[model samples]
Target chain A: NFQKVEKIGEGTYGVVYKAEVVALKKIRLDTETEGVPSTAIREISLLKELNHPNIVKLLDVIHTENKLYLVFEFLHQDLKKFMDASALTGIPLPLIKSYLFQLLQGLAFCHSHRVLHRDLKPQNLLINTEGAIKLADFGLARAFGVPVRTYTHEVVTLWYRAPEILLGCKYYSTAVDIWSLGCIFAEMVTRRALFPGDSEIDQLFRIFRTLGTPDEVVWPGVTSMPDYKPSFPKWARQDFSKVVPPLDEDGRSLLSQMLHYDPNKRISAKAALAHPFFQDVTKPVPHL
Target chain B: QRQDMTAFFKLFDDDLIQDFLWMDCCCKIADKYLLAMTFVYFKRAKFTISEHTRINFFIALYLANTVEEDEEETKYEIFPWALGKNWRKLFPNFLKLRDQLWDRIDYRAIVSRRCCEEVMAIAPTHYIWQRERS
Candidate 1:
């Protein structure tokens, strides 16, 4: 009786509310098939398909006469708060590393389950007071061809999105999630977003400015990405230390590899876990 | 005009700081849209935020006015009472809003049952296979 609550929001497809339970879908006055929304279809079925401690749970769904109820396990809080706290007071480096590991472990499980968590962001990473981190909000996550699949590049939050997606790559893999994880990893330690961009172009330019400007010499086949624009000015890359001042030399090593402009060259979650940056890192026992 | 950091600190003299942070975490859900549902009537009643208002909100939930018990198989109710047997009699009008709130809600148990036995065809990659070795 005390776990999940229904939250009501703007009438659009039903949103959330008593403090935690938002307004869920209550009825359908019309009798049409009312096929489920794309995200809902993926989120529900995908969550049920895969089970892990690092993944959110889908509690129960009640269907009575004209009602639809979605039940979920409890969530304590979010990453934006976790990020804000890095600047507010401070977050221990060990916990930061633990969270990053949990994320990759979750990613490992997700990819193993053959599900693509297309949208990964600070908001989607659910947290708790016990200091546990888990993935949620699969609005853009679900099935994709293991390879050679053309997904809409317009997915994922703009700032955390990958460059290949920005360049309109039809052939993408879970590499997009790796790119996002790199962004999350950097932002967590830097105590600020690595690149908070306004548009896809703004983000691309920001990456170009921080990393080297994209040229065929470093990133082969750049001019061919269906949406490439070589018109932006080329700026030499900033030395890593200036970008994330407090990162260890080893941490920077992984960040650079993970944030690589070339998708093929990007670091995988398993590889990142094996990096020297997290040599001694292990899971933190969240104070649940 | 009187205090700064520890004004209400005495109220929670025994609890750890982590518990306060935990409660603060839940308040975010309160500040979102569902917040409007739970506390909308308080504003309409012209009640400003105060400790008293906070207690009444709890009382709203305490009375199960916000939840509607729907699970027929579970008999999960706890008992709390009006100690000294006072209050609410004078506030009969607004207090009546608390009835059957449980029927209106259920805490989450999982992803919806609609997704039960969900499956996907994408085969696991070498990366996943390698990581499983760890």
Candidate 2:
């Protein structure tokens, strides 16, 4: 038809294509007993469960004989692409501050509902022509337990993964999502990943090189972590303001709190939004 | 095959179906709301109790579990355990059956609290009472 035309992107379990102005995410059901991929199931159910302006809306669902289609209200580009295009011109400070505010607004809602966007990379945050940011790709998102439960440790992209997750901590919570937001915040300002690690070890090393190696003094129980090693390099901490030239003292303080070694100590979405870093964000952008 | 079907159907009845729902819920130790949800899905899809009633109930249970259960616990392999010991012989192609059930229900898995409560109210007294306990 005139609607289903161009391939937009593909994810772990599905392919997304543009249909007119809407996006059609196709989850191929080629197997019999496999039923729906759990990611697809979670994405559909969680999107249906949650409702917020900054969260992408699920417009409709269509299932064929061998395929399941998720119709979503389409946004033109993801934050990743937006940042890439604006790399040369550079994203304005005000725009970065506003965008981070919206991100916090959405993520705060998610946490309020006890849902964790386990993967909160730039690619998962969608933006529209109206300059509104909507949190998308809930395929990896989940409603964390009332008390901490041992979850699948292998969530979030390697680069954005929290120290606890990188060290194989399954008993995680919303704190992990906060860590990714810190990575995203730094990226938005610098127009590059703050911690670009090739593997798990390298990612931890990347973080340590910038944030310093954790000890029981800074992050209690660091030595007891599954992957903790005494032989690891002890790197002195680098100043965030120095590394990210654009951020002021408040911004550096917020970023450091988010990138805290201890998950319990990481800044929550609600708290982060209230930080002095967002003091200049005067108004909430009107939703699309 | 005919013998297995006879045995499978022998395990079916109005009361037995309730027991099956209870057993499946207990086996998985999932939320009791999911059990009532199977009934909700069954009624919503305009399904009738025929010779396929048992399979329909199991399919509804599996579908409810799929919709409401956590991904870590919703692995497809454990699904057949609800199908019973002779599931391999009786409902070997149930993946196809699961797909068909998903379509027949039009992919509506999320049920409201009132809907769940209303469905739970009509269930056996034991199920109602067991779920209502604090």
Candidate 3:
């Protein structure tokens, strides 16, 4: 319990490239600094204990003379490629609902285990043909707890980053995770990034430019954050209709609740599951 | 002693007792906790030899430790919680070697350039020749 290894779990070796004699997989031993990378240590140590279906499984870590190789069970494909494939025609609504539900299930399990999945972009999310959304790439995933100290300000990627994180709140909790979940939710619905900001400041503005200025009224301590700029611009609350077109009332309601500027008030993954929008998920669609 | 070295060899590559401690390469401190870790693995190994018979030994040990730690979490067997003070809990046979092990290390001679930064990586300039002289 003493070691604090950040979850720097990266890469999804989607499918193993077929090889007959390649039991000879060799990782280069090119580290100039120390025995093993501490980031590498964290992922191996954490994944050793984490056994969840929604989460990717780490098959093994191999250390040959100079380098380390992480082996994972070959998955069919990752979510980004899957999303890209369906970009033109768009994915079916029921499939989206199924994928989103599976994602929530994974997030709920992770959060329950005291793990804060700091990164929640589409590229990190994975899926199989059976419509299971596995939350992969736990490299930035961290074990959050009582003294959840300030992590480095630069994390979670720009576009999907939460407003609280963008404004420089370091002592934040799992609230930041749900915010990314909200961003992913909107993206999955619209087939585009909800806030495609080129820079951190631009990211905050894209969010505020639509969600209205998250002033002290809605968020009591919004201005007290480390990087909360006084020059931060304002705009009226955006209608979800224009941006995320074709979303029904219940879908919009859940998305709005998930994207609430006040992170504490934001819909939690577990809570997002019980939403009225999910009632149809249990109704059973096609395929006899 | 062969049994102890064999067990340690099961987890780590090349090993401490047999390969390192007597190697003319370096007069070394193999990070006490990292040594203590070998003992922990010996005590905690639950499954059969077949269960651990992986193609790669390093991969086998990772899988082995993960299986053990999953059942009971120590948060990385030698994760520096006590600054590795659990040297007392280790195999007594291993500790018997430790009483005189530090003396075998030429601490004064460890100073040679290693921009590479391996804790155990030492230069051939001193200990090998010093031990050669005495």
Candidate 4:
């Protein structure tokens, strides 16, 4: 009983449209020599297991002769547009805090289940009229059965990429998402990207400029990464308080924990909920 | 030059050559887990590796790879995986064949861990060893 309304967005895999009250991701296979894109299949496989208010709900999948449709619960706007609309004035502190809390709440569940939202950005975070934030776009996401299995490093947007990913570390963990969260957190505060880089090397240099150059002291085995080079530019760290002037001391403390050089030492989504910055926010009820 | 006539003449059986071709094509594209799922999907469709329905094996593996593996590394060309020249001549509409197999499996491409292990138990020694290494 799904009726198409208008096109909302389009990606490499499929075109998303707003249905009567649900979202439809139409995967056209007319021109594709391949039957269905693996991206859509991966999204369906992962979304089937995940069930939470903070995560977008997959309603149904319609497979026609020349097309495939993925039905999802509709949301009015994404956080990217919301941020753009409020760019001049910036989002209120309370609203940003609530959004971050909701994001971590969904992320904790994902990590607990051994899944990683490899790509996390403001555009992927859906926001409704109630200010509810739901994590969307699991096309690039994959479940890691083994703790340290090597996976493809070509994940996450360049602007929000983690230092480890930028360095070509295939054996990564949920810490990758935490780094993006830190980037998102800073962006939410400043109404701009924290470390927006044009290229991979530039991305690393931007991160180093903001957080100082990583070394064996702060991050063991940092020099051994695939893309790491000894000739890299050395830049001193900048103060977070100065970078994101709107964030308070507790907020900055939480942000620092997420932006830790060592992925092993980075604060987890579960632990970030307990941080003082989110202490005032209401505790999220367990989904299970 | 008469390079390897003796080695080539060692085995001329149709079945053995078919088996070798199947394993060579499949092993190059998929791991043991995917092969198991391919086998399961093939069986689920009630298809068998006989003279009448031999090409289904390749299509099953193709579908399994398309569903399970990341697309960046795995090439989606059906010519190599589909048995050399016979496949191209017999099944001209390769995409239609793929779609038929997908529909036969009920579009349930995501295989379970238990299903993979169950298939692994009965899998060949080399496949099992490969599974253990990963």
Clashes of each: 39, 0, 4, 0
Q: Judged by lDDT relative to the true structure, which candidate is superior, 1 or 2?
A: 2
List per-model TM-scores for chain B: 0.26, 0.62, 0.21, 0.62
A211 Cα displacement, candidate 3 (Å): 1.4
Give lDDT per model, in order. 0.57, 0.73, 0.55, 0.74
For model 4, residues A101-148, the per-residue Cα lDDT tens digits are: 999999999998778898899899988887688899998887664222
Tell me the docking grade of candidate 3.
Answer: incorrect
Off by over 4 Å in 4: A30-34, A146-150, A283-288, B1-28, B39-54, B71-78, B86-108, B111-115, B118-134
Candidate with the greatest TM-score versus the true structure:
4
Candidate number with greatest lDDT: 4
Instruction: Give the top-scoring candidate (DockQ).
Output: 2
Q: Per-residue lDDT of B31-129 in model 2, one digit per residue for the tens?
A: 456556666666667664453466665766666666555544543433455566666544435655766666676655556555666654543464332
| Pick by TM-score: 1 or 2, better one | 2
Candidate 2: count the clashes.
Answer: 0
Q: What is the DockQ of each candidate?
A: 0.01, 0.19, 0.03, 0.17
DockQ of 4: 0.17
What lDDT tens digits, residue by residue, belong to model 4 across residues B56-107? 6567666666655555445344555455656545444565676677766655
**Model 2 lDDT tens row, A191-288:** 99988999999999999998998889898988888888899899898897668998888888888898888888778998888898776785433223
Q: On a 0 to 1 DockQ scale, where is model 3?
A: 0.03
